[PDB]
């Protein structure tokens, strides 16, 4: 499925992910797309921080969902 | 009515509130339920931040609505 991640600067990145893919997989996709480290990226969905062990289906992430990406120092 | 508040840890808290109840009453209920002070608690719902001088009906908060709770340091 297609998902969208918005950064704090308004930049939007579109990625292809599956419901069974974990947040670690989304972090790896973001690292491939932009170069931000997986440990330096924090994912927020519906006002709750996404867990790396939990998957997109566990967080009820559907197609064309919007997530928030935070860059960590 | 019944409302749901989700934190960053994934825990969902169910609260009994009314449309005329202000966000200060919701903060007092959250302080009674979890112990988090109202001064460090921020409520996010429907793309806007909850104001202490506003009510749930002003924010168009209906039954079984989901809000996001942020705990300040």
């Amino acid at each position: 499925m297609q998902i969208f991640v918005k950064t704090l600067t308004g930049k939007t990145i579109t990625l292809e992910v599956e419901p069974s893919d974990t947040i670690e997989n989304v972090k790896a996709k973001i690292q491939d797309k932009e170069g931000i480290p997986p440990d330096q990226q924090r994912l927020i969905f519906a006002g709750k921080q996404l867990e790396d062990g939990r998957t997109l289906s566990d967080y009820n992430i559907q197609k064309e969902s919007t997530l928030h990406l935070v860059l960590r120092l | 009515m019944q409302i749901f508040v989700k934190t960053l840890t994934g825990k969902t808290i169910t609260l009994e509130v009314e449309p005329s109840d202000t966000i200060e009453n919701v903060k007092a209920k959250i302080q009674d339920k979890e112990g988090i002070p109202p001064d460090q608690q921020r409520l996010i719902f429907a793309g806007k931040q909850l104001e202490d001088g506003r009510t749930l009906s002003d924010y168009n908060i209906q039954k079984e609505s989901t809000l996001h709770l942020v705990l300040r340091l």
Binding site: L8, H68, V70, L73 | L73
Partner: peptide
């Protein structure tokens, strides 16, 4: 919204990292 919550959390984490930098300072000199 998710964006304003993300910005607030980013600003708070930047404050935490600035406190960490101040602690590193107190270690150094």
């Amino acid at each position: 919204s998710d964006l304003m919550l993300a910005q607030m959390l980013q600003m708070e984490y930047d404050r935490e990292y600035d406190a960490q930098l101040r602690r590193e300072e107190k270690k150094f000199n």
